mmCIF file of C-alpha atoms and ligand atoms in Angstrom:
data_model
loop_
_atom_site.group_PDB
_atom_site.id
_atom_site.type_symbol
_atom_site.label_atom_id
_atom_site.label_comp_id
_atom_site.label_asym_id
_atom_site.label_seq_id
_atom_site.Cartn_x
_atom_site.Cartn_y
_atom_site.Cartn_z
ATOM 1 C CA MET A 1 59.076 44.359 33.646
ATOM 2 C CA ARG A 2 58.792 42.990 37.171
ATOM 3 C CA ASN A 3 55.899 40.670 37.904
ATOM 4 C CA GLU A 4 55.777 38.453 40.967
ATOM 5 C CA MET A 5 53.345 35.786 42.134
ATOM 6 C CA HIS A 6 53.154 33.543 45.225
ATOM 7 C CA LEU A 7 51.108 30.373 45.572
ATOM 8 C CA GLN A 8 50.279 28.010 48.454
ATOM 9 C CA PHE A 9 48.283 24.784 48.251
ATOM 10 C CA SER A 10 47.750 21.604 50.249
ATOM 11 C CA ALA A 11 50.225 18.838 49.540
ATOM 12 C CA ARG A 12 47.592 16.625 47.931
ATOM 13 C CA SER A 13 48.350 15.173 44.506
ATOM 14 C CA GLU A 14 45.218 16.403 42.756
ATOM 15 C CA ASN A 15 46.979 19.770 42.872
ATOM 16 C CA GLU A 16 49.576 18.773 40.304
ATOM 17 C CA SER A 17 47.868 19.992 37.126
ATOM 18 C CA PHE A 18 46.887 23.024 39.184
ATOM 19 C CA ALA A 19 50.484 23.950 40.000
ATOM 20 C CA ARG A 20 51.375 23.531 36.351
ATOM 21 C CA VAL A 21 48.553 25.675 35.039
ATOM 22 C CA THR A 22 49.260 28.430 37.522
ATOM 23 C CA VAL A 23 52.987 28.632 36.860
ATOM 24 C CA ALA A 24 52.598 28.273 33.121
ATOM 25 C CA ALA A 25 49.765 30.790 32.848
ATOM 26 C CA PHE A 26 51.922 33.257 34.758
ATOM 27 C CA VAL A 27 55.081 32.616 32.767
ATOM 28 C CA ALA A 28 52.879 32.823 29.678
ATOM 29 C CA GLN A 29 53.296 36.572 30.122
ATOM 30 C CA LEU A 30 56.836 36.309 28.767
ATOM 31 C CA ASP A 31 55.290 35.255 25.465
ATOM 32 C CA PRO A 32 57.015 31.838 25.345
ATOM 33 C CA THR A 33 56.565 28.944 22.946
ATOM 34 C CA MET A 34 54.189 26.066 23.637
ATOM 35 C CA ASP A 35 57.337 24.033 24.248
ATOM 36 C CA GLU A 36 59.141 26.361 26.642
ATOM 37 C CA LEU A 37 55.897 26.189 28.636
ATOM 38 C CA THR A 38 55.485 22.425 28.476
ATOM 39 C CA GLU A 39 59.060 22.313 29.822
ATOM 40 C CA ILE A 40 58.256 24.767 32.608
ATOM 41 C CA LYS A 41 55.168 22.730 33.571
ATOM 42 C CA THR A 42 57.486 19.709 33.750
ATOM 43 C CA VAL A 43 60.169 21.395 35.851
ATOM 44 C CA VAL A 44 57.283 22.351 38.112
ATOM 45 C CA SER A 45 55.713 18.900 38.244
ATOM 46 C CA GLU A 46 59.135 17.570 39.277
ATOM 47 C CA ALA A 47 59.827 19.913 42.188
ATOM 48 C CA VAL A 48 56.208 20.056 43.320
ATOM 49 C CA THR A 49 55.938 16.307 43.059
ATOM 50 C CA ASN A 50 59.097 15.880 45.182
ATOM 51 C CA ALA A 51 57.813 18.139 47.942
ATOM 52 C CA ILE A 52 54.436 16.338 48.054
ATOM 53 C CA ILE A 53 55.880 12.805 48.317
ATOM 54 C CA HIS A 54 59.350 13.226 49.837
ATOM 55 C CA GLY A 55 59.122 16.368 51.926
ATOM 56 C CA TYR A 56 55.683 15.536 53.362
ATOM 57 C CA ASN A 57 55.495 11.791 52.710
ATOM 58 C CA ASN A 58 52.129 12.537 51.087
ATOM 59 C CA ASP A 59 50.563 14.338 54.063
ATOM 60 C CA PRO A 60 47.565 16.354 52.721
ATOM 61 C CA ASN A 61 48.406 19.075 55.276
ATOM 62 C CA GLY A 62 51.967 19.611 54.081
ATOM 63 C CA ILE A 63 51.145 22.852 52.241
ATOM 64 C CA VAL A 64 53.363 23.384 49.202
ATOM 65 C CA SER A 65 54.597 26.877 48.399
ATOM 66 C CA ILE A 66 55.468 28.231 44.967
ATOM 67 C CA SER A 67 57.026 31.552 43.971
ATOM 68 C CA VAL A 68 57.491 32.958 40.480
ATOM 69 C CA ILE A 69 59.131 36.253 39.644
ATOM 70 C CA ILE A 70 59.186 37.139 35.979
ATOM 71 C CA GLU A 71 61.595 39.965 35.207
ATOM 72 C CA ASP A 72 63.477 41.143 32.150
ATOM 73 C CA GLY A 73 62.618 37.950 30.278
ATOM 74 C CA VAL A 74 63.974 35.577 32.925
ATOM 75 C CA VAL A 75 61.570 33.332 34.795
ATOM 76 C CA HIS A 76 62.523 32.887 38.436
ATOM 77 C CA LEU A 77 60.684 29.868 39.783
ATOM 78 C CA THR A 78 60.933 28.543 43.361
ATOM 79 C CA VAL A 79 59.283 25.591 45.051
ATOM 80 C CA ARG A 80 59.636 25.011 48.772
ATOM 81 C CA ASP A 81 58.233 22.763 51.493
ATOM 82 C CA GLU A 82 58.655 22.728 55.289
ATOM 83 C CA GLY A 83 59.084 18.964 55.264
ATOM 84 C CA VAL A 84 61.547 16.121 55.936
ATOM 85 C CA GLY A 85 64.422 17.681 54.009
ATOM 86 C CA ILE A 86 67.280 16.100 52.099
ATOM 87 C CA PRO A 87 70.246 14.524 53.984
ATOM 88 C CA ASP A 88 72.854 14.531 51.232
ATOM 89 C CA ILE A 89 72.225 17.064 48.479
ATOM 90 C CA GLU A 90 74.764 16.226 45.772
ATOM 91 C CA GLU A 91 73.912 12.529 46.302
ATOM 92 C CA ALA A 92 70.117 12.801 46.282
ATOM 93 C CA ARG A 93 70.610 15.000 43.233
ATOM 94 C CA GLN A 94 72.384 12.282 41.248
ATOM 95 C CA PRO A 95 70.818 10.614 38.177
ATOM 96 C CA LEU A 96 68.644 7.568 38.851
ATOM 97 C CA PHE A 97 68.920 8.046 42.636
ATOM 98 C CA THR A 98 65.843 7.607 44.800
ATOM 99 C CA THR A 99 64.606 7.124 48.377
ATOM 100 C CA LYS A 100 61.236 5.866 47.272
ATOM 101 C CA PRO A 101 62.296 3.704 44.276
ATOM 102 C CA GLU A 102 58.641 2.735 44.333
ATOM 103 C CA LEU A 103 59.018 3.480 40.633
ATOM 104 C CA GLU A 104 55.936 5.469 39.701
ATOM 105 C CA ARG A 105 57.668 7.879 37.304
ATOM 106 C CA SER A 106 61.431 7.495 37.604
ATOM 107 C CA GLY A 107 64.658 8.034 39.467
ATOM 108 C CA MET A 108 65.109 11.175 37.387
ATOM 109 C CA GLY A 109 63.747 14.519 38.552
ATOM 110 C CA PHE A 110 66.689 16.762 39.312
ATOM 111 C CA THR A 111 67.902 15.576 35.951
ATOM 112 C CA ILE A 112 64.801 16.831 34.200
ATOM 113 C CA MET A 113 64.988 20.069 36.231
ATOM 114 C CA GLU A 114 68.713 20.389 35.587
ATOM 115 C CA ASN A 115 68.014 19.711 31.918
ATOM 116 C CA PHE A 116 65.152 22.046 30.985
ATOM 117 C CA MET A 117 65.995 24.999 33.267
ATOM 118 C CA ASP A 118 69.126 27.113 32.741
ATOM 119 C CA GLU A 119 69.971 27.023 36.428
ATOM 120 C CA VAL A 120 68.860 24.831 39.332
ATOM 121 C CA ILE A 121 69.886 25.466 42.922
ATOM 122 C CA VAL A 122 68.636 23.225 45.698
ATOM 123 C CA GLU A 123 68.652 23.847 49.449
ATOM 124 C CA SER A 124 67.587 21.646 52.334
ATOM 125 C CA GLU A 125 68.168 20.958 56.030
ATOM 126 C CA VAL A 126 66.508 17.943 57.640
ATOM 127 C CA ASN A 127 63.039 18.595 59.076
ATOM 128 C CA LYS A 128 63.257 22.256 58.069
ATOM 129 C CA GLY A 129 62.426 21.667 54.401
ATOM 130 C CA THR A 130 63.706 22.043 50.841
ATOM 131 C CA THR A 131 63.827 25.124 48.590
ATOM 132 C CA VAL A 132 64.507 24.421 44.911
ATOM 133 C CA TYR A 133 65.409 27.417 42.766
ATOM 134 C CA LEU A 134 64.965 26.773 39.014
ATOM 135 C CA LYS A 135 65.406 29.465 36.379
ATOM 136 C CA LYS A 136 64.785 29.666 32.656
ATOM 137 C CA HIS A 137 65.530 32.644 30.442
ATOM 138 C CA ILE A 138 63.102 33.040 27.529
ATOM 139 C CA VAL A 139 64.076 34.458 24.125
ATOM 140 C CA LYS A 140 62.324 36.214 21.214
ATOM 141 C CA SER A 141 62.505 36.201 17.402
ATOM 142 C CA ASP B 1 25.316 23.831 25.716
ATOM 143 C CA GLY B 2 26.079 25.081 29.223
ATOM 144 C CA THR B 3 26.516 21.651 30.830
ATOM 145 C CA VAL B 4 29.547 21.140 28.582
ATOM 146 C CA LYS B 5 31.235 19.454 31.585
ATOM 147 C CA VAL B 6 34.341 21.637 31.071
ATOM 148 C CA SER B 7 36.283 18.394 30.724
ATOM 149 C CA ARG B 8 34.976 17.877 27.180
ATOM 150 C CA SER B 9 34.896 21.597 26.368
ATOM 151 C CA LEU B 10 38.475 22.175 27.539
ATOM 152 C CA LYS B 11 39.759 19.020 25.873
ATOM 153 C CA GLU B 12 38.274 20.021 22.517
ATOM 154 C CA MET B 13 39.955 23.416 22.579
ATOM 155 C CA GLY B 14 43.119 21.563 23.522
ATOM 156 C CA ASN B 15 43.246 19.739 20.238
ATOM 157 C CA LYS B 16 42.558 22.937 18.333
ATOM 158 C CA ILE B 17 45.807 24.176 19.876
ATOM 159 C CA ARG B 18 47.905 21.295 18.573
ATOM 160 C CA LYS B 19 46.509 22.142 15.141
ATOM 161 C CA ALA B 20 46.917 25.909 15.492
ATOM 162 C CA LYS B 21 50.527 25.333 16.552
ATOM 163 C CA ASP B 22 51.713 23.629 13.367
ATOM 164 C CA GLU B 23 49.541 25.954 11.284
ATOM 165 C CA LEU B 24 51.310 29.039 12.605
ATOM 166 C CA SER B 25 54.678 27.286 12.516
ATOM 167 C CA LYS B 26 54.266 27.066 8.731
ATOM 168 C CA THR B 27 52.598 30.461 8.477
ATOM 169 C CA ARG B 28 55.424 32.071 10.504
ATOM 170 C CA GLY B 29 58.335 29.815 9.659
ATOM 171 C CA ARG B 30 59.348 28.983 13.222
ATOM 172 C CA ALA B 31 57.795 27.903 16.485
ATOM 173 C CA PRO B 32 54.713 29.965 17.291
ATOM 174 C CA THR B 33 54.151 31.978 20.443
ATOM 175 C CA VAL B 34 51.542 31.188 23.123
ATOM 176 C CA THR B 35 50.154 34.623 22.301
ATOM 177 C CA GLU B 36 50.136 34.020 18.566
ATOM 178 C CA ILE B 37 48.317 30.736 19.159
ATOM 179 C CA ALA B 38 46.019 32.526 21.570
ATOM 180 C CA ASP B 39 45.177 35.130 18.905
ATOM 181 C CA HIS B 40 44.825 32.509 16.180
ATOM 182 C CA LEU B 41 42.190 30.835 18.377
ATOM 183 C CA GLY B 42 40.386 33.943 19.623
ATOM 184 C CA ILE B 43 41.380 33.009 23.156
ATOM 185 C CA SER B 44 43.769 34.359 25.825
ATOM 186 C CA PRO B 45 47.301 33.000 26.395
ATOM 187 C CA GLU B 46 46.111 31.807 29.777
ATOM 188 C CA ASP B 47 43.194 29.846 28.343
ATOM 189 C CA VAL B 48 45.621 28.255 25.909
ATOM 190 C CA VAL B 49 47.721 27.086 28.859
ATOM 191 C CA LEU B 50 44.628 25.842 30.660
ATOM 192 C CA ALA B 51 43.243 23.995 27.656
ATOM 193 C CA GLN B 52 46.645 22.483 26.888
ATOM 194 C CA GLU B 53 46.770 20.759 30.275
ATOM 195 C CA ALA B 54 43.438 19.016 29.567
ATOM 196 C CA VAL B 55 44.830 17.502 26.355
ATOM 197 C CA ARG B 56 47.898 15.867 27.968
ATOM 198 C CA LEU B 57 45.855 13.789 30.440
ATOM 199 C CA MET C 1 36.838 17.065 50.823
ATOM 200 C CA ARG C 2 38.783 20.108 52.036
ATOM 201 C CA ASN C 3 41.146 21.570 49.448
ATOM 202 C CA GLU C 4 42.478 25.101 49.836
ATOM 203 C CA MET C 5 44.670 27.486 47.810
ATOM 204 C CA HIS C 6 46.247 30.906 48.487
ATOM 205 C CA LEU C 7 47.475 33.267 45.785
ATOM 206 C CA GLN C 8 49.059 36.733 45.831
ATOM 207 C CA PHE C 9 50.415 38.830 42.986
ATOM 208 C CA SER C 10 51.363 42.341 41.938
ATOM 209 C CA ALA C 11 48.362 44.581 41.366
ATOM 210 C CA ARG C 12 48.907 44.768 37.632
ATOM 211 C CA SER C 13 46.150 44.958 35.019
ATOM 212 C CA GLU C 14 47.872 41.976 33.367
ATOM 213 C CA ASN C 15 47.244 39.570 36.263
ATOM 214 C CA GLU C 16 43.491 39.531 35.741
ATOM 215 C CA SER C 17 43.617 36.721 33.180
ATOM 216 C CA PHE C 18 46.237 34.909 35.219
ATOM 217 C CA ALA C 19 43.977 35.092 38.253
ATOM 218 C CA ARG C 20 40.801 33.686 36.663
ATOM 219 C CA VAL C 21 42.661 30.899 34.917
ATOM 220 C CA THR C 22 44.295 29.911 38.211
ATOM 221 C CA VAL C 23 41.050 29.983 40.156
ATOM 222 C CA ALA C 24 39.361 28.104 37.307
ATOM 223 C CA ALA C 25 42.066 25.456 37.192
ATOM 224 C CA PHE C 26 41.572 24.903 40.931
ATOM 225 C CA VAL C 27 37.781 25.053 41.093
ATOM 226 C CA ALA C 28 37.989 22.674 38.169
ATOM 227 C CA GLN C 29 38.538 19.809 40.625
ATOM 228 C CA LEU C 30 34.804 20.097 41.260
ATOM 229 C CA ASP C 31 34.108 19.178 37.637
ATOM 230 C CA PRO C 32 31.651 22.092 37.156
ATOM 231 C CA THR C 33 29.808 22.948 33.963
ATOM 232 C CA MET C 34 31.652 25.114 31.435
ATOM 233 C CA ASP C 35 28.814 27.476 32.322
ATOM 234 C CA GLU C 36 29.589 27.531 36.066
ATOM 235 C CA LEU C 37 33.366 27.723 35.584
ATOM 236 C CA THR C 38 32.715 30.769 33.413
ATOM 237 C CA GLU C 39 30.661 32.632 36.002
ATOM 238 C CA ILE C 40 33.272 31.820 38.663
ATOM 239 C CA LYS C 41 35.914 32.947 36.188
ATOM 240 C CA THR C 42 34.013 36.202 35.538
ATOM 241 C CA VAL C 43 33.538 37.053 39.171
ATOM 242 C CA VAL C 44 37.241 36.594 39.859
ATOM 243 C CA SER C 45 38.095 38.978 37.051
ATOM 244 C CA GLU C 46 35.562 41.581 38.266
ATOM 245 C CA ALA C 47 36.918 41.482 41.829
ATOM 246 C CA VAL C 48 40.614 41.473 40.905
ATOM 247 C CA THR C 49 40.168 44.301 38.451
ATOM 248 C CA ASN C 50 38.291 46.204 41.123
ATOM 249 C CA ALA C 51 41.144 45.587 43.556
ATOM 250 C CA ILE C 52 43.700 46.719 41.032
ATOM 251 C CA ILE C 53 41.985 49.775 39.515
ATOM 252 C CA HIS C 54 40.347 50.939 42.758
ATOM 253 C CA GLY C 55 41.985 49.438 45.830
ATOM 254 C CA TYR C 56 45.478 50.275 44.594
ATOM 255 C CA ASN C 57 44.497 52.902 42.057
ATOM 256 C CA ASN C 58 46.701 51.021 39.575
ATOM 257 C CA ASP C 59 49.839 50.972 41.740
ATOM 258 C CA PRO C 60 51.820 47.814 40.762
ATOM 259 C CA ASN C 61 53.187 47.497 44.303
ATOM 260 C CA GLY C 62 49.625 46.697 45.346
ATOM 261 C CA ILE C 63 49.576 42.922 45.786
ATOM 262 C CA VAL C 64 46.151 41.369 45.370
ATOM 263 C CA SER C 65 45.480 38.403 47.624
ATOM 264 C CA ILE C 66 43.236 35.543 46.529
ATOM 265 C CA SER C 67 42.055 32.554 48.508
ATOM 266 C CA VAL C 68 39.931 29.621 47.425
ATOM 267 C CA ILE C 69 38.495 26.810 49.489
ATOM 268 C CA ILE C 70 36.812 23.819 47.896
ATOM 269 C CA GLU C 71 34.744 21.867 50.388
ATOM 270 C CA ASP C 72 31.832 19.652 49.380
ATOM 271 C CA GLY C 73 30.292 21.152 46.271
ATOM 272 C CA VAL C 74 31.049 24.704 47.347
ATOM 273 C CA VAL C 75 33.599 27.199 46.215
ATOM 274 C CA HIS C 76 34.873 29.705 48.744
ATOM 275 C CA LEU C 77 36.463 32.621 46.996
ATOM 276 C CA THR C 78 38.070 35.596 48.722
ATOM 277 C CA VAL C 79 39.658 38.586 47.076
ATOM 278 C CA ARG C 80 41.487 40.941 49.417
ATOM 279 C CA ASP C 81 43.572 44.107 49.131
ATOM 280 C CA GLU C 82 45.482 46.379 51.517
ATOM 281 C CA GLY C 83 44.231 49.301 49.491
ATOM 282 C CA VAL C 84 42.179 52.478 49.654
ATOM 283 C CA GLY C 85 38.999 50.960 51.045
ATOM 284 C CA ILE C 86 35.346 51.574 50.173
ATOM 285 C CA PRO C 87 33.834 54.741 51.754
ATOM 286 C CA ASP C 88 30.283 53.401 51.510
ATOM 287 C CA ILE C 89 29.655 49.723 50.767
ATOM 288 C CA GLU C 90 25.912 49.926 50.106
ATOM 289 C CA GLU C 91 26.491 52.736 47.624
ATOM 290 C CA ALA C 92 29.361 51.045 45.833
ATOM 291 C CA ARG C 93 27.156 47.971 45.356
ATOM 292 C CA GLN C 94 24.189 49.640 43.737
ATOM 293 C CA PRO C 95 24.237 49.043 39.957
ATOM 294 C CA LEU C 96 25.821 51.580 37.622
ATOM 295 C CA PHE C 97 27.611 53.334 40.469
ATOM 296 C CA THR C 98 31.276 54.091 39.964
ATOM 297 C CA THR C 99 33.945 56.449 41.229
ATOM 298 C CA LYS C 100 35.692 56.601 37.886
ATOM 299 C CA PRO C 101 32.721 57.415 35.653
ATOM 300 C CA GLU C 102 34.921 59.459 33.285
ATOM 301 C CA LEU C 103 36.944 56.296 32.706
ATOM 302 C CA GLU C 104 34.540 54.114 30.714
ATOM 303 C CA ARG C 105 33.514 52.138 33.771
ATOM 304 C CA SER C 106 31.009 49.331 33.254
ATOM 305 C CA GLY C 107 28.589 50.682 35.799
ATOM 306 C CA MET C 108 28.064 46.991 36.640
ATOM 307 C CA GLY C 109 30.503 44.897 38.648
ATOM 308 C CA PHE C 110 29.235 44.185 42.109
ATOM 309 C CA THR C 111 26.019 43.564 40.241
ATOM 310 C CA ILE C 112 27.784 40.964 38.115
ATOM 311 C CA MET C 113 29.281 39.411 41.274
ATOM 312 C CA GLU C 114 25.894 39.205 43.004
ATOM 313 C CA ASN C 115 24.244 37.500 40.007
ATOM 314 C CA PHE C 116 26.840 34.826 39.270
ATOM 315 C CA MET C 117 27.691 33.868 42.823
ATOM 316 C CA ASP C 118 25.318 32.573 45.480
ATOM 317 C CA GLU C 119 26.643 34.904 48.151
ATOM 318 C CA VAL C 120 28.759 38.055 47.981
ATOM 319 C CA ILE C 121 29.894 39.761 51.135
ATOM 320 C CA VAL C 122 32.010 42.858 51.386
ATOM 321 C CA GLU C 123 34.174 44.022 54.267
ATOM 322 C CA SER C 124 36.028 47.281 53.773
ATOM 323 C CA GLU C 125 37.578 50.102 55.811
ATOM 324 C CA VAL C 126 38.946 53.310 54.318
ATOM 325 C CA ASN C 127 42.756 53.317 54.141
ATOM 326 C CA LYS C 128 42.729 49.732 55.403
ATOM 327 C CA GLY C 129 41.668 47.714 52.359
ATOM 328 C CA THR C 130 38.830 45.603 50.982
ATOM 329 C CA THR C 131 37.721 41.979 51.120
ATOM 330 C CA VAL C 132 35.002 40.489 48.945
ATOM 331 C CA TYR C 133 33.739 37.058 49.935
ATOM 332 C CA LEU C 134 31.854 35.165 47.140
ATOM 333 C CA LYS C 135 30.430 31.680 47.531
ATOM 334 C CA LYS C 136 29.368 29.337 44.751
ATOM 335 C CA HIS C 137 27.578 26.051 45.320
ATOM 336 C CA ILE C 138 28.407 23.778 42.382
ATOM 337 C CA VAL C 139 25.705 21.422 41.126
ATOM 338 C CA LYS C 140 25.845 17.621 41.250
ATOM 339 C CA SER C 141 23.360 15.456 39.347
HETATM 340 N N1 ADP D 1 61.151 18.164 48.305
HETATM 341 C C1 ADP D 1 61.934 17.119 48.771
HETATM 342 N N2 ADP D 1 61.877 16.756 50.114
HETATM 343 C C2 ADP D 1 62.647 15.739 50.561
HETATM 344 N N3 ADP D 1 63.515 14.989 49.816
HETATM 345 C C3 ADP D 1 63.563 15.356 48.478
HETATM 346 C C4 ADP D 1 62.837 16.370 47.888
HETATM 347 N N4 ADP D 1 63.160 16.439 46.534
HETATM 348 C C5 ADP D 1 64.030 15.512 46.348
HETATM 349 N N5 ADP D 1 64.329 14.828 47.443
HETATM 350 C C6 ADP D 1 65.337 13.637 47.562
HETATM 351 O O1 ADP D 1 66.014 13.388 46.272
HETATM 352 C C7 ADP D 1 65.714 12.000 45.773
HETATM 353 C C8 ADP D 1 65.684 12.018 44.237
HETATM 354 O O2 ADP D 1 64.564 12.785 43.675
HETATM 355 P P1 ADP D 1 64.234 12.705 42.077
HETATM 356 O O3 ADP D 1 65.466 12.894 41.249
HETATM 357 O O4 ADP D 1 63.020 13.616 41.803
HETATM 358 O O5 ADP D 1 63.678 11.194 41.974
HETATM 359 P P2 ADP D 1 62.410 10.600 42.690
HETATM 360 O O6 ADP D 1 61.209 11.563 42.455
HETATM 361 O O7 ADP D 1 62.168 9.221 41.899
HETATM 362 O O8 ADP D 1 62.790 10.403 44.116
HETATM 363 C C9 ADP D 1 64.401 11.697 46.481
HETATM 364 O O9 ADP D 1 64.160 10.286 46.577
HETATM 365 C C10 ADP D 1 64.568 12.344 47.900
HETATM 366 O O10 ADP D 1 65.337 11.485 48.812
HETATM 367 N N1 ADP D 2 38.763 46.889 45.957
HETATM 368 C C1 ADP D 2 38.187 48.138 45.947
HETATM 369 N N2 ADP D 2 38.875 49.189 46.484
HETATM 370 C C2 ADP D 2 38.331 50.397 46.482
HETATM 371 N N3 ADP D 2 37.115 50.730 45.989
HETATM 372 C C3 ADP D 2 36.436 49.684 45.462
HETATM 373 C C4 ADP D 2 36.868 48.394 45.396
HETATM 374 N N4 ADP D 2 35.895 47.617 44.791
HETATM 375 C C5 ADP D 2 34.939 48.426 44.529
HETATM 376 N N5 ADP D 2 35.192 49.670 44.907
HETATM 377 C C6 ADP D 2 34.277 50.887 44.748
HETATM 378 O O1 ADP D 2 33.010 50.451 44.226
HETATM 379 C C7 ADP D 2 32.674 51.117 42.964
HETATM 380 C C8 ADP D 2 31.858 50.161 42.156
HETATM 381 O O2 ADP D 2 32.576 48.998 41.675
HETATM 382 P P1 ADP D 2 31.916 48.173 40.452
HETATM 383 O O3 ADP D 2 30.499 47.928 40.720
HETATM 384 O O4 ADP D 2 32.818 47.032 40.120
HETATM 385 O O5 ADP D 2 32.101 49.235 39.248
HETATM 386 P P2 ADP D 2 33.393 49.780 38.578
HETATM 387 O O6 ADP D 2 34.360 48.614 38.435
HETATM 388 O O7 ADP D 2 32.796 50.173 37.207
HETATM 389 O O8 ADP D 2 33.900 50.938 39.296
HETATM 390 C C9 ADP D 2 34.021 51.527 42.437
HETATM 391 O O9 ADP D 2 33.885 52.673 41.579
HETATM 392 C C10 ADP D 2 34.846 51.890 43.728
HETATM 393 O O10 ADP D 2 34.620 53.276 44.139
HETATM 394 MG MG1 MG D 3 60.660 13.384 41.823
HETATM 395 MG MG1 MG D 4 34.444 46.586 38.682
#
């Protein structure tokens, strides 16, 4: 098949569960397992959470943008923000690394993303914003 | 009862999913599908996803 | 509060469930009654189906556009399509009226919209597309 969806919401935090539901409900079309989904909703919470806090330093006007393109059993997620951006990519993408070590969750994030998803490609450019790929093929039995 | 707050209503269905999951896992002999769980509950795969979220929090 | 969301997706029969769940998840922030969230959820399905089966006459390349605005106990729903358009609005809105009678068409629809929502406004232009408003004031005790 070929199903695509595009979502845009304010960079508030109360929109976390919302981003999860929306992406999951859409990827639910691929007939996944309750786990594959719970993973997807995590991968999402990671990227979307980053944007909200890093990209827009929690500015309720930041507007987060999500894109999902299911096709031939392969989910094609994408989260992007027009915020602050990431100076060093490979470095900010290293395990335990942070800019806001204000705990509250971890130091992990690109680790979780890197883990669950089959492929994760990041892209940023100071003040322009970041565009995280994220892809996860889903199988059948 | 109408004024089921949605919080309570959604949370209740959430548990039913945990249960339906292991039930079908045994019944099928492998992890069950969102759809299969949806059907087992007389609900849509989307409502399963929605209800699930309420149970985690 | 002023929370807003914007969703777009292929005009596929399959995205009707996706759409209501998404809207529901979002309008959920208002902590409405399971009763209210259902009406809201019904209206979304009626309007998106209408957009898909009428506006785009089932053409997947359609792209339905949804927009929700939560702002102080009120839900602001908007379903839009760059489709066929409605020749006569007043006629299309009278109960039991349909253009696809020979296709098991619940004569109802706009009638359902009007009953569940507080306000329903339609703006349409042939070969331009259609936009249904829909406003729901959610109760607070
Ligand atoms: N959307 C984003 N906008 C700006 N910087 C980001 C974004 N996502 C990640 N980063 C950078 O990568 C670092 C590591 O992110 P992550 O692994 O999720 O841990 P954490 O969420 O604890 O920061 C962040 O502190 C930040 O400097
Ligand atoms: N988005 C739309 N695009 C084109 N025509 C529409 C649209 N929505 C409604 N209509 C017109 O209004 C009629 C009535 O819609 P409705 O009351 O929902 O009934 P039904 O869904 O059974 O056709 C439709 O048959 C169609 O001709
Ligand atoms: Mg993070
Ligand atoms: Mg209709």
